[PDB]
Design an enzyme around this catalytic site. Sequence first.
Site, PDB file in Angstrom:
ATOM      1  N   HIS A   1       2.099   4.475  -2.927  1.00 39.43           N
ATOM      2  CA  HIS A   1       2.470   6.037  -2.727  1.00 39.43           C
ATOM      3  C   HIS A   1       3.952   6.527  -2.992  1.00 39.43           C
ATOM      4  CE1 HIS A   1      -1.166   7.277  -0.591  1.00 39.43           C
ATOM      5  NE2 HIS A   1      -1.192   6.343   0.292  1.00 39.43           N
TER       6      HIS A   1
ATOM      7  N   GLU B   1      -3.666   8.139  -3.471  1.00 39.89           N
ATOM      8  CA  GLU B   1      -4.293   7.088  -3.186  1.00 39.89           C
ATOM      9  C   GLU B   1      -4.514   5.998  -4.137  1.00 39.89           C
ATOM     10  OE1 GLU B   1      -4.556   6.321  -0.150  1.00 39.89           O
ATOM     11  OE2 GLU B   1      -5.981   4.560  -0.060  1.00 39.89           O
TER      12      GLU B   1
ATOM     13  N   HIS C   1       0.828  -1.292  -0.003  1.00 40.75           N
ATOM     14  CA  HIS C   1      -0.071   0.008  -0.149  1.00 40.75           C
ATOM     15  C   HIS C   1       0.837   1.453  -0.044  1.00 40.75           C
ATOM     16  CE1 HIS C   1      -3.550   2.267   1.138  1.00 40.75           C
ATOM     17  NE2 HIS C   1      -2.819   3.147   1.331  1.00 40.75           N
ATOM     18  N   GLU C   2       1.878   1.419   0.878  1.00 41.35           N
ATOM     19  CA  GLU C   2       2.663   2.618   1.183  1.00 41.35           C
ATOM     20  C   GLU C   2       3.439   2.500  -0.257  1.00 41.35           C
ATOM     21  OE1 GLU C   2       0.657   3.369   4.490  1.00 41.35           O
ATOM     22  OE2 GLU C   2       1.988   4.433   3.303  1.00 41.35           O
TER      23      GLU C   2
END
Lengths: 509, 509
Positions: free
Chosen positions: B280, B306, B276-277
């Site tokens: 980003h 996002e 997820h990170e």
Amino acid sequence: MTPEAAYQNLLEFQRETAYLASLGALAAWDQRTMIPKKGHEHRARQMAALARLLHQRMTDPRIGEWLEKVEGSPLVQDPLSDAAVNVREWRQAYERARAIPERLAVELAQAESEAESFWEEARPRDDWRGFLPYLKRVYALTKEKAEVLFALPPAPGDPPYGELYDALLDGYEPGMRARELLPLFAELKEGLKGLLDRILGSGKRPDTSILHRPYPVEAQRRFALELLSACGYDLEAGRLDPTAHPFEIAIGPGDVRITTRYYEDFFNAGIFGTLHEMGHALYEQGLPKEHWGTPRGDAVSLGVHESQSRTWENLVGRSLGFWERFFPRAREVFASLGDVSLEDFHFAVNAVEPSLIRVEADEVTYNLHILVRLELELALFRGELSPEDLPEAWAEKYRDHLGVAPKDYKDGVMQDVHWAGGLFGYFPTYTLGNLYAAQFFQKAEAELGPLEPRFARGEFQPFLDWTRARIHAEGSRFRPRVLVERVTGEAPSARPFLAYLEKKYAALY
Amino acid sequence: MTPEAAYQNLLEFQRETAYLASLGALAAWDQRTMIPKKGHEHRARQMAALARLLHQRMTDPRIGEWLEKVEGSPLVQDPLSDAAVNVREWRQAYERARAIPERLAVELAQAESEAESFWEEARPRDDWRGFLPYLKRVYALTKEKAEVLFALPPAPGDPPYGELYDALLDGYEPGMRARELLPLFAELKEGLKGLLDRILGSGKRPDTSILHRPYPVEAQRRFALELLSACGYDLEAGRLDPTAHPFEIAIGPGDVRITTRYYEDFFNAGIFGTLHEMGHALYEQGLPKEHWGTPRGDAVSLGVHESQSRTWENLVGRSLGFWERFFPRAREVFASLGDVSLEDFHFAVNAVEPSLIRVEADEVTYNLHILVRLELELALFRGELSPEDLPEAWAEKYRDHLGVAPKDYKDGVMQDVHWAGGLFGYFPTYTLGNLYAAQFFQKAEAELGPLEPRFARGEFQPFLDWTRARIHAEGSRFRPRVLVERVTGEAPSARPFLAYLEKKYAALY
């Protein structure tokens, strides 16, 4: 405006600058510990932007306006009060900053940064020829900075400059002068020569081979962390991380970090590197937190700071008492110490030998390295030596003082980055640290009684508290020379240090 | 002063501010990762010190003088030029900074710092009575900020504000309005309702128990690091560290860092948290480095940001091809998976189930969590709901949208730190992210051909290069809505996302 109002605005403004500088301190810490490999260029740019901001703040005319409003007022009648100490130190820093012309400051900073950068790769290439131009540029600009600061009055209370070199010395060790240094080194140099005679002519020889056996790095880290909490370093307000070159950096109250370099086949680096940095850390963690960001709450000088690092690294860290306490533990942690006795280990970690590299030099020969640098620096700023002749002078000085001479530039005149960084009049502070460390220690034992037996029991807090109340808590309230005299009752001397070396090594060799 | 000179001074001054602000980013990263326990109070003061400095720079009247010289000049005739993009955005930021009183910004920053501190301690405790006062302060100050910005004209080219709330939405998603959000959520609510029903009445059930077996954290780290480099994350320009709440932060070019949180007894958190990170971070590592510290080189919005994180976490990270590629490795790293099939594991990490915690919610139910927050935030700012009545409204909202409601505050209104931190009009961007991700991914497969087979082979660079060229390289050249339309050819819609979900879970369930 009233003096109290002027003092508050000055207080707020000055602490704002300190908070801003501390963000730079965090970035500097990160750069040597966690920064990604490709993040260096951006980091340098961040630091440069910060440097320009801080320089602008340190010369802001308002500082002078507010100061003049507070100076001479009842707020600072008592020179020992927090207010007078801050105002006095702020005025001096302000004057030193404004005395240096804009272009000079910009040129010098750029020259140092570039010299350092080129030096990083030049040294391993043994490329003095390519490095010289960068060094001369830094030197020429430093000499100019010194000539400007030398024509101006010293800090109120300090003795006059005896020569332009004192203007540089003064910046790192407030109040120190070459005429005060020279006799200390004379005493020191003679004592070390007498001691080296006994050691070199001794039949006893330490088994350093033990220190080069295997010492798992993850284990060294665990052992180090144990010694850290045992000695009194607050891990809730600091941390230990691995780095290329050990250093200590204070971010602010409750955040003082240290680092060390571990070698899988060399016990000393990681362990004594840790204790060394811890010494600096304990001093910072001991400063009065309520006064953070003001001179009253700042460390007083590099010499005094180095006296705290050497105290814990050597006076405590390499003492027999210290190891009676931790050697058995190290025996449980490190398999390589299986067939090693406390006596052999304690002797090995205190091995003496004239060598070429200052940073790796033992307690006894270490300061001879500083003397070399000091003599070379004096000759330079006195117009007796040329940068072009540094290599020759360096080799001859080493041969004369240590009995060993470099065979190249790499491990000779190019071993340290200091000169590339414009750090002239800096090296002597290392020696002052060793001399003060011993003086403070002598006084501590006279009031608390022999410390060895307490260290042997893991009782370091009484001694630590002592350094807190007598040294740390005082911040920059007193000039370093005055602090030493108020705590020990005697002006700085090399005798307590020599006395310490003689006893310890007479027993070893 | 020619317009060129004005633009040049503006660029230099604005980037300098960018560099100074990036020191704060490093402090925020450190605060959640390496900071010692007792250093928090100092860090907060450092942040406030930096904020004071930045505010001065951001409201410097020179910015207005320069901007006036460049606006309407030949430098910005082309609306897509680097210059025009930067000038447009600088004027908007300048007008914002000047509009918000210095006192409100400070008080608000302090109200949030305090609200957050008390929160993370009052949540483990079911203490809503103690937290409420802190929330009301933050809320009150946030509404004031909204009112100030709302009384001002929106950025040129952006649609008018339809209500107070839009002033907040705009800050996170430039140009977004509740006007365009609701129809998207109604669409989404309708689609999700039906899929959850089919899934529930489904005879297929995932073995989530597998994910709760033991998973050594060190093995999880080594596995995470494998996924990172395999997906295109540059570890030489970043790093992975544990933290309490995973996040990602860009320090600068060549330095983009991420964090995760591992649970020895729960596979998902550490692994999918990492991916997820990473999404980003991939975005940040893809922004044009030459334009760093410039609007042209800044990430466009939280929604687009996002969309990148959810792309790699779910679209790629939870796909069949991704696991055909990495399950064998996982099988080898974790004993708990020794008796697990790819089909069962893949089904497991995609298990759907209405639950109470947003950050733990599955792909299908997740956005219903966001819907609840939006309705509540709209009710609050529309003056139809009082912060004291949030617990009740929260419960009702949850039962109706998800079919399950909290029984306490801990796993209810107090689960997210967002409102304490003053992040209002923020939650909706999570849904835009999931929607944009579906739309971006669609265009990608159209131009690149089925991605499932490539992922199965570990061939991710083609897809990543596509996102770099079509999304990351553009920085903030276009408004987020325009960016999406220029890349996908479609306006934001919930249908591509619903189509994605219906196809995926019709297969699993």
